[PDB]
JSON list of N, CA and C in Angstrom, two decimals:
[
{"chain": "U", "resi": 1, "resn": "UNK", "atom": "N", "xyz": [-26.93, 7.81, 156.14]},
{"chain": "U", "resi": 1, "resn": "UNK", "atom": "CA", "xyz": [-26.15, 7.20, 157.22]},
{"chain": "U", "resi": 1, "resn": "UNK", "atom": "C", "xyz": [-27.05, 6.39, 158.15]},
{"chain": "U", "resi": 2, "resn": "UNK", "atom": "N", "xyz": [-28.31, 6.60, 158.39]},
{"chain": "U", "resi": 2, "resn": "UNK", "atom": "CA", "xyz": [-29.34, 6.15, 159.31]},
{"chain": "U", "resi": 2, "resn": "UNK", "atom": "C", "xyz": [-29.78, 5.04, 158.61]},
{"chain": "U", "resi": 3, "resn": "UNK", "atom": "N", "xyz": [-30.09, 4.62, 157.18]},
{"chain": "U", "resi": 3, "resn": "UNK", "atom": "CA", "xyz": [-29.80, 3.54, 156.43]},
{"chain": "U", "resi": 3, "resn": "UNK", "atom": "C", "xyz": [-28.76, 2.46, 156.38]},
{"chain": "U", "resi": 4, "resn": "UNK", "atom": "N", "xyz": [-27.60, 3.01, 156.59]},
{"chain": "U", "resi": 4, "resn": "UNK", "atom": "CA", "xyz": [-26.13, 2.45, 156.38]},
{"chain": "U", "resi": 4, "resn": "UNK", "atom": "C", "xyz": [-26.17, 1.72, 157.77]},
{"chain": "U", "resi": 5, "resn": "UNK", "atom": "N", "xyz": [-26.48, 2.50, 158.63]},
{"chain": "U", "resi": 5, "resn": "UNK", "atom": "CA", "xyz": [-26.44, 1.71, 159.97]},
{"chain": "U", "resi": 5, "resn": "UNK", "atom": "C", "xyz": [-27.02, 0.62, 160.46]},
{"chain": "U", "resi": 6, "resn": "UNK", "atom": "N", "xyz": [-28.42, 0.57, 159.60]},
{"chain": "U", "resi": 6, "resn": "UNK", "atom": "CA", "xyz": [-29.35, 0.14, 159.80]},
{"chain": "U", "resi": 6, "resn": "UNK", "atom": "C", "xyz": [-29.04, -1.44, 159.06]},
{"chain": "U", "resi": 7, "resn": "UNK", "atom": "N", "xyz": [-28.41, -1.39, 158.14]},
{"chain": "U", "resi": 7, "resn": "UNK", "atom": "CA", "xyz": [-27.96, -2.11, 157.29]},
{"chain": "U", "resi": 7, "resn": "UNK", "atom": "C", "xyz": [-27.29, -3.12, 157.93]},
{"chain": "U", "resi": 8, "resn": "UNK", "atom": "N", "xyz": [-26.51, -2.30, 158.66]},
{"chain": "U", "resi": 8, "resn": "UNK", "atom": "CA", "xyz": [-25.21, -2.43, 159.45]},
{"chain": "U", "resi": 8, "resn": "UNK", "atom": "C", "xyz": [-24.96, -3.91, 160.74]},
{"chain": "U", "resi": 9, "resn": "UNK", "atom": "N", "xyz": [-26.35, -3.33, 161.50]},
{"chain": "U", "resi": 9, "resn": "UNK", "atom": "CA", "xyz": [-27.15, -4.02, 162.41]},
{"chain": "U", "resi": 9, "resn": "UNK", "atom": "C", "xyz": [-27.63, -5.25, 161.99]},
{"chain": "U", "resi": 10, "resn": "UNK", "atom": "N", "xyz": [-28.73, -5.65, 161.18]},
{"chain": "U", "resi": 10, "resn": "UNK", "atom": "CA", "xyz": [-29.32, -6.37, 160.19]},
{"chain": "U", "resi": 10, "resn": "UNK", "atom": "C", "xyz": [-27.85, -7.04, 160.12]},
{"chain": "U", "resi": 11, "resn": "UNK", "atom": "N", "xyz": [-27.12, -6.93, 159.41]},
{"chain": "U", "resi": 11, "resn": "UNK", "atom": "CA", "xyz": [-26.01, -7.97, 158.29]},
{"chain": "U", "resi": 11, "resn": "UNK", "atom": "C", "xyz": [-25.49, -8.39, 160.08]},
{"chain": "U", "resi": 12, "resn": "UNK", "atom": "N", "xyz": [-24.91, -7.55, 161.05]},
{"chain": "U", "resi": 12, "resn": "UNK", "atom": "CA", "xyz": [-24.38, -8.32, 162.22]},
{"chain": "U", "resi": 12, "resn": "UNK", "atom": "C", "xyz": [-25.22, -9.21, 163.27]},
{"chain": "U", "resi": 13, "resn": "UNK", "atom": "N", "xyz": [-26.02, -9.31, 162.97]},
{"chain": "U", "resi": 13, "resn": "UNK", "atom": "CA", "xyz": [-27.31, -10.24, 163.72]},
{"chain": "U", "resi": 13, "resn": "UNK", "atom": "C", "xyz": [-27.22, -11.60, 162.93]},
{"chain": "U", "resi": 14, "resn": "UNK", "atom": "N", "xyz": [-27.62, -11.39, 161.67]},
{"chain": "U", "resi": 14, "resn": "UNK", "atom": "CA", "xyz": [-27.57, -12.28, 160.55]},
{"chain": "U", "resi": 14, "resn": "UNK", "atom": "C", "xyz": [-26.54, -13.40, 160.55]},
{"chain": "U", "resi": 15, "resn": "UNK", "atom": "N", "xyz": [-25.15, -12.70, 160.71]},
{"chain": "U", "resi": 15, "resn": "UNK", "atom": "CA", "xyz": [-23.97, -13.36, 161.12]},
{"chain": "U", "resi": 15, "resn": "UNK", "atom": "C", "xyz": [-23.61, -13.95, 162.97]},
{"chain": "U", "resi": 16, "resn": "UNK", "atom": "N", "xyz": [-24.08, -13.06, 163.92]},
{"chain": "U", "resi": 16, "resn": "UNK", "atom": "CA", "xyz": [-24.70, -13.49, 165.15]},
{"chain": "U", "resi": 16, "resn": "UNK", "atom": "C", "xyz": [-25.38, -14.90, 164.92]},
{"chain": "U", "resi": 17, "resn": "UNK", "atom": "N", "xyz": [-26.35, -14.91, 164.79]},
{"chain": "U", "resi": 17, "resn": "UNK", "atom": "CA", "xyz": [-27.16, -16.02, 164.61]},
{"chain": "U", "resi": 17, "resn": "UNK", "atom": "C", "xyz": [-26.68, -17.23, 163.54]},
{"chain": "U", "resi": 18, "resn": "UNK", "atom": "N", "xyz": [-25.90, -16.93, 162.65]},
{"chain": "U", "resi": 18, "resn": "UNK", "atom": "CA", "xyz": [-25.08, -18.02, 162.06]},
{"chain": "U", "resi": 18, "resn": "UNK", "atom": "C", "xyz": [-23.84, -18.72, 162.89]},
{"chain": "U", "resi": 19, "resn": "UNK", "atom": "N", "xyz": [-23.35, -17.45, 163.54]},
{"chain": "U", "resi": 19, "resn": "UNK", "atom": "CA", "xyz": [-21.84, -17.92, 164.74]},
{"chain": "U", "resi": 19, "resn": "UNK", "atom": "C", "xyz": [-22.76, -18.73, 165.93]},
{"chain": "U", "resi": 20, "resn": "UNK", "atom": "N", "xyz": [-24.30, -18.71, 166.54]},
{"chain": "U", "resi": 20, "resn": "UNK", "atom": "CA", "xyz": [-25.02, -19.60, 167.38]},
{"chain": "U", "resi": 20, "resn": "UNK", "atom": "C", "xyz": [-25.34, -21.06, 166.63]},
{"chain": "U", "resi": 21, "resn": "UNK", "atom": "N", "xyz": [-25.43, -21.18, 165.73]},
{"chain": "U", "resi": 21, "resn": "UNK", "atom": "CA", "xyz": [-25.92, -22.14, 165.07]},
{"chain": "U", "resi": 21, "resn": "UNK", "atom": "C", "xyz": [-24.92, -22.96, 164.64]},
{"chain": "U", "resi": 22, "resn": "UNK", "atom": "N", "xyz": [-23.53, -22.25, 164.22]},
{"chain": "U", "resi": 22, "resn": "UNK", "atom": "CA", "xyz": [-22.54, -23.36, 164.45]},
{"chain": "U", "resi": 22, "resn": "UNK", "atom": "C", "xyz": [-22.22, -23.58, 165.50]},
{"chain": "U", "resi": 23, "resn": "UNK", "atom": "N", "xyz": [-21.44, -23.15, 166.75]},
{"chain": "U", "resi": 23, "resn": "UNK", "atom": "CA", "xyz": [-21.90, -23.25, 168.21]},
{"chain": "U", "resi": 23, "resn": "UNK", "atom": "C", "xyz": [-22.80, -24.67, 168.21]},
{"chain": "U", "resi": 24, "resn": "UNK", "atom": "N", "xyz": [-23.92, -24.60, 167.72]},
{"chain": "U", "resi": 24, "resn": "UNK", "atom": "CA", "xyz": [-25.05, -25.70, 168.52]},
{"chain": "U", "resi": 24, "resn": "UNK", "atom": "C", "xyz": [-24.19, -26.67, 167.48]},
{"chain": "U", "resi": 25, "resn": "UNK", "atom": "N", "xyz": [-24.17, -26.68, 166.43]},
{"chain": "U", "resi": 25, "resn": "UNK", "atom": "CA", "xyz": [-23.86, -27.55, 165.45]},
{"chain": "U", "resi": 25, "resn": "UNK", "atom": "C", "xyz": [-22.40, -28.47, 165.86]},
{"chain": "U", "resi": 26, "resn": "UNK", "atom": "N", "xyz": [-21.24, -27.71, 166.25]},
{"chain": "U", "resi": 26, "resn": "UNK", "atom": "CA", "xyz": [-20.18, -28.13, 166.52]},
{"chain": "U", "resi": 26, "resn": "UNK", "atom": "C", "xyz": [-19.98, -28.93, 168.36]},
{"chain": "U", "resi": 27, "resn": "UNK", "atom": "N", "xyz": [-21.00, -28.41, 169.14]},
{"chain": "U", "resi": 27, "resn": "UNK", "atom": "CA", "xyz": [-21.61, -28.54, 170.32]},
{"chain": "U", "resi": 27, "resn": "UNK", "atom": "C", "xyz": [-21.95, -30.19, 170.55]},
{"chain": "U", "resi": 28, "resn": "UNK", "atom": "N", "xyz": [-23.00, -30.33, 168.96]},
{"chain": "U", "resi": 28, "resn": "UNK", "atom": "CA", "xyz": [-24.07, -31.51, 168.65]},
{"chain": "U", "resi": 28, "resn": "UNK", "atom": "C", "xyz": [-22.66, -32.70, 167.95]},
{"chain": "U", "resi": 29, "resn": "UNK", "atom": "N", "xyz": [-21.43, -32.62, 167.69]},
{"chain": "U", "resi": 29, "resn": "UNK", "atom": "CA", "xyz": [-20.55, -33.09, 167.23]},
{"chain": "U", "resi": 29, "resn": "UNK", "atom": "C", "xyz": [-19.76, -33.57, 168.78]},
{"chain": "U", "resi": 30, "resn": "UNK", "atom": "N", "xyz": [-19.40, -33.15, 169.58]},
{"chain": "U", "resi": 30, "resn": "UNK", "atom": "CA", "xyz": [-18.36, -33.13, 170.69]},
{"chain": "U", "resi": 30, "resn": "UNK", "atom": "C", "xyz": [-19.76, -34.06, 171.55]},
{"chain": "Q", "resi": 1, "resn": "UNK", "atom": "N", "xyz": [-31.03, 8.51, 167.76]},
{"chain": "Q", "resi": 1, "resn": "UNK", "atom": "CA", "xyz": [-31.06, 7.67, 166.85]},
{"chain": "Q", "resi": 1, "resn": "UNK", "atom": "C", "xyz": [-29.68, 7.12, 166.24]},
{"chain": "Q", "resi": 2, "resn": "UNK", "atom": "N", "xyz": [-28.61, 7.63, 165.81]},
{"chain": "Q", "resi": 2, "resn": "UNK", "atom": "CA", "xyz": [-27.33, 7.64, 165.29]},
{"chain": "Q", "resi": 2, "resn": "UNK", "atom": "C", "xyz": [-26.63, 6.81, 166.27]},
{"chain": "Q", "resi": 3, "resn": "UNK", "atom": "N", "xyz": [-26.81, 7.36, 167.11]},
{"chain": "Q", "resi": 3, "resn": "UNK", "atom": "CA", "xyz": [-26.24, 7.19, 168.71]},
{"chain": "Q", "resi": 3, "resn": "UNK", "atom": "C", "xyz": [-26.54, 5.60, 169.17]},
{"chain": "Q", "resi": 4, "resn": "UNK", "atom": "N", "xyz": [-28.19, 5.40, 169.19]},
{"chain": "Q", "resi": 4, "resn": "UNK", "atom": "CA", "xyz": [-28.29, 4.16, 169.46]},
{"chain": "Q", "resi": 4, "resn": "UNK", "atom": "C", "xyz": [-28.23, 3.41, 168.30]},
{"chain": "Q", "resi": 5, "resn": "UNK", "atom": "N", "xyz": [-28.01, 3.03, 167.16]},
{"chain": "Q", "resi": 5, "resn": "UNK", "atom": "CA", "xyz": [-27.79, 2.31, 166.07]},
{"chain": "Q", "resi": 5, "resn": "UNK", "atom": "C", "xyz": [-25.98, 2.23, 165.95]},
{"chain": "Q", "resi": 6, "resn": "UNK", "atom": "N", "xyz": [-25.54, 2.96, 166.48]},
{"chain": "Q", "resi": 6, "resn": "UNK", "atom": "CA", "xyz": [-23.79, 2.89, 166.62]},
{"chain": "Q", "resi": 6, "resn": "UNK", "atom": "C", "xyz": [-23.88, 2.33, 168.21]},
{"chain": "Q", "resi": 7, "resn": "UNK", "atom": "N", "xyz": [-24.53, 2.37, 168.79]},
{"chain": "Q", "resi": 7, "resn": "UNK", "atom": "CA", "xyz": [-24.37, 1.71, 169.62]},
{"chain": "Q", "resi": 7, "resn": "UNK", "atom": "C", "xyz": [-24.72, -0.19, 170.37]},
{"chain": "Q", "resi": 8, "resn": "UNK", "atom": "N", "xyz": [-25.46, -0.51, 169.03]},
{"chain": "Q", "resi": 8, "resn": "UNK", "atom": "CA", "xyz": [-26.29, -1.78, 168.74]},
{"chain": "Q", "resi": 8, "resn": "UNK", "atom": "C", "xyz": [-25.27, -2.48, 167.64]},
{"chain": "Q", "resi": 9, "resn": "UNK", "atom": "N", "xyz": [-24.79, -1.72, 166.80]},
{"chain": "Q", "resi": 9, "resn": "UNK", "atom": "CA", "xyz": [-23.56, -2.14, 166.11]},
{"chain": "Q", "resi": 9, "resn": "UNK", "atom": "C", "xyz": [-22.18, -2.74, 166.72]},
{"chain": "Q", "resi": 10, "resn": "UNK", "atom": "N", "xyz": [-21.64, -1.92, 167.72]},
{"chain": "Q", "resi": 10, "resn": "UNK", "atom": "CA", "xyz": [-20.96, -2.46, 168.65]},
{"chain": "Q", "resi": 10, "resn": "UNK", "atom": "C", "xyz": [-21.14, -3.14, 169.52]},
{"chain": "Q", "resi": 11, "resn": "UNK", "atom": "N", "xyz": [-22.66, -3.23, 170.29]},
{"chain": "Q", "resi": 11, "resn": "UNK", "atom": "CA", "xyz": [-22.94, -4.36, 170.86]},
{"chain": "Q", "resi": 11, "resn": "UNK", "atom": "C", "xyz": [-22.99, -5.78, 170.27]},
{"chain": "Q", "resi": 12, "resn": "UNK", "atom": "N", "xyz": [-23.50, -5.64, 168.74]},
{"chain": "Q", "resi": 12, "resn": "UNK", "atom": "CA", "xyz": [-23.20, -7.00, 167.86]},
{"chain": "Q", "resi": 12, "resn": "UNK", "atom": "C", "xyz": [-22.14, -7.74, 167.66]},
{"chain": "Q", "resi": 13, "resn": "UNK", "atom": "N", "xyz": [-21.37, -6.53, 166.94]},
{"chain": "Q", "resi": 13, "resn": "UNK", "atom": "CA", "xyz": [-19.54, -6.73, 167.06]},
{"chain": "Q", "resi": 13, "resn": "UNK", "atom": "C", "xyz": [-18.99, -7.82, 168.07]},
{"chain": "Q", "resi": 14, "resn": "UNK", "atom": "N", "xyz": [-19.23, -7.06, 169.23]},
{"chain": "Q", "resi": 14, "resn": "UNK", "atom": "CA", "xyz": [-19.08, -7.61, 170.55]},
{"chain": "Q", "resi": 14, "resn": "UNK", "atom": "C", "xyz": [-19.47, -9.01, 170.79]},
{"chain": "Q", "resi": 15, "resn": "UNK", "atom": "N", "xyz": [-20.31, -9.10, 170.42]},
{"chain": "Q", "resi": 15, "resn": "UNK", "atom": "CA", "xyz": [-21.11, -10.21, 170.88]},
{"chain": "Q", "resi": 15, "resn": "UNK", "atom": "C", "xyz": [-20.34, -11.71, 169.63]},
{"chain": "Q", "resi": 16, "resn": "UNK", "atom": "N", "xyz": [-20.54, -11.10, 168.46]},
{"chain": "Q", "resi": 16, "resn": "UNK", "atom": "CA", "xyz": [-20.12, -12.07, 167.12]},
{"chain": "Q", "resi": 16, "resn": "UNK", "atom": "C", "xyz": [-18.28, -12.37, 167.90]},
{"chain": "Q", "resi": 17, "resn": "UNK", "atom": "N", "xyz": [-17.37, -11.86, 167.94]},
{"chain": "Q", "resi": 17, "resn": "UNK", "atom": "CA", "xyz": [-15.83, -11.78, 168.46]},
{"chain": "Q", "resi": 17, "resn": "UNK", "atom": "C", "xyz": [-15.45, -13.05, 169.43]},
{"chain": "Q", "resi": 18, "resn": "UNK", "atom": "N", "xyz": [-16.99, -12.92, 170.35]},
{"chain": "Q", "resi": 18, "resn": "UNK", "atom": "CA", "xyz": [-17.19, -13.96, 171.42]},
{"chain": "Q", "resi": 18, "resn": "UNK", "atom": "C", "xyz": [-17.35, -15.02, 171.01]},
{"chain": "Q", "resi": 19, "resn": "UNK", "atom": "N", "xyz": [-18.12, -15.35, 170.04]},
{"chain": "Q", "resi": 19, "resn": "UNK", "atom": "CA", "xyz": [-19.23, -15.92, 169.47]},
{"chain": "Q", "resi": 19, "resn": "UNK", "atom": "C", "xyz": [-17.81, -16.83, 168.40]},
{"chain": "Q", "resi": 20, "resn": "UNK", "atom": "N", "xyz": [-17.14, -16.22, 167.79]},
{"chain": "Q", "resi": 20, "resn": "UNK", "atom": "CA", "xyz": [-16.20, -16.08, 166.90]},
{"chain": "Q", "resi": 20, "resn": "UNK", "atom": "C", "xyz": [-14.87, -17.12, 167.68]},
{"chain": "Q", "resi": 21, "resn": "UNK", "atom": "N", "xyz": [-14.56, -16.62, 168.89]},
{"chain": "Q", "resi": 21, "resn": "UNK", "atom": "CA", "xyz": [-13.71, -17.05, 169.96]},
{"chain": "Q", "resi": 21, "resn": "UNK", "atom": "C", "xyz": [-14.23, -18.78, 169.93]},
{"chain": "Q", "resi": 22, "resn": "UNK", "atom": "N", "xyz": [-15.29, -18.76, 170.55]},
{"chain": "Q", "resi": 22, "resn": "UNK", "atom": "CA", "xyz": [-16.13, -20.10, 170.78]},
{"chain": "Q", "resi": 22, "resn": "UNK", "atom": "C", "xyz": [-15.73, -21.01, 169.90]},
{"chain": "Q", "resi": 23, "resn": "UNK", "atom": "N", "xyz": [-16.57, -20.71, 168.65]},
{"chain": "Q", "resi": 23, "resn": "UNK", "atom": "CA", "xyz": [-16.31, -21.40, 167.50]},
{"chain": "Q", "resi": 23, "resn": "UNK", "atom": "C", "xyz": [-15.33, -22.11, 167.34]},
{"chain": "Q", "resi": 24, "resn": "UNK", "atom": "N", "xyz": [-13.90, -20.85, 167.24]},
{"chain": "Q", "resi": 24, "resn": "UNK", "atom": "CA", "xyz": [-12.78, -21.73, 167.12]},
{"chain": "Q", "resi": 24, "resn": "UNK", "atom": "C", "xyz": [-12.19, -22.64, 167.66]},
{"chain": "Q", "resi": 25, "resn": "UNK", "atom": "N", "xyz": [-12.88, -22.25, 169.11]},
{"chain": "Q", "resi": 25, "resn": "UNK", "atom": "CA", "xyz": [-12.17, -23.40, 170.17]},
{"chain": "Q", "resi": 25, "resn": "UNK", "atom": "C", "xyz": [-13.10, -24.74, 170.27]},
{"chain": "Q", "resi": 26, "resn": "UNK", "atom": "N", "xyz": [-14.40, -25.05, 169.30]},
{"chain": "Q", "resi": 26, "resn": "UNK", "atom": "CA", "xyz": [-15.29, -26.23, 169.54]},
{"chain": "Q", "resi": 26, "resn": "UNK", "atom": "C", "xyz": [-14.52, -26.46, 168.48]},
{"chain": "Q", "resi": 27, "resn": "UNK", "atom": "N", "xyz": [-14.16, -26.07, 167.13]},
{"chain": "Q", "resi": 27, "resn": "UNK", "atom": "CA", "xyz": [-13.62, -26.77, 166.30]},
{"chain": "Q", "resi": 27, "resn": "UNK", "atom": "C", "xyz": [-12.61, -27.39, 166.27]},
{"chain": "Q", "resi": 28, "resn": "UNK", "atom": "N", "xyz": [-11.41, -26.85, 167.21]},
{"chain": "Q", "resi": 28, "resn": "UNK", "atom": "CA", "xyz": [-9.95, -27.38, 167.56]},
{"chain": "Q", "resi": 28, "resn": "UNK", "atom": "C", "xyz": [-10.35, -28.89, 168.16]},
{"chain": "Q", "resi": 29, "resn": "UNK", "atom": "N", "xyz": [-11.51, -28.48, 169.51]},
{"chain": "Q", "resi": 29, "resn": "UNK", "atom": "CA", "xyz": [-11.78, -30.26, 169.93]},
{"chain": "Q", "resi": 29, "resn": "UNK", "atom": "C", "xyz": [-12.46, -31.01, 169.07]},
{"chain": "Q", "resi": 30, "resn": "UNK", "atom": "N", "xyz": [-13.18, -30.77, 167.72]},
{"chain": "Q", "resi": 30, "resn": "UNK", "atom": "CA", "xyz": [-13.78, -32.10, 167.21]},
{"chain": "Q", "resi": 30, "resn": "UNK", "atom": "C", "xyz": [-12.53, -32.00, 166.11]},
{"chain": "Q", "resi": 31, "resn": "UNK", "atom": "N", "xyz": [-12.18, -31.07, 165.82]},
{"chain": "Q", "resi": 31, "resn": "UNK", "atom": "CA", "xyz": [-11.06, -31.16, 164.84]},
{"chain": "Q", "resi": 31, "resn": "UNK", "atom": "C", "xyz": [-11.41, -30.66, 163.54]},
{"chain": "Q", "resi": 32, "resn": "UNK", "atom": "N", "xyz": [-11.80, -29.57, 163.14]},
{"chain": "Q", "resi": 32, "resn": "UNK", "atom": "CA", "xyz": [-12.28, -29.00, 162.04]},
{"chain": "Q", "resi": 32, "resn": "UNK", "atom": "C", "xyz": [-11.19, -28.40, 161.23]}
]
């Protein structure tokens, strides 16, 4: 479970930092 | 440990929803 979580964290950052980058991307469009 | 890793999880959550919110609304104005 301390794995799973860990996992967990990792994959929602990953996706964090993809939802900022469109943000700048769609930002750099307007 | 459990505790703060369930608790960094939901802070992510949290944060992506927002993040998620945003998105949709820059895309409505350029038109995606």
């Amino acid at each position: 479970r301390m794995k799973q979580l860990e996992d967990k964290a990792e994959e929602l950052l990953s996706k964090n930092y993809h939802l900022e980058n469109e943000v700048a991307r769609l930002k750099k469009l307007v």
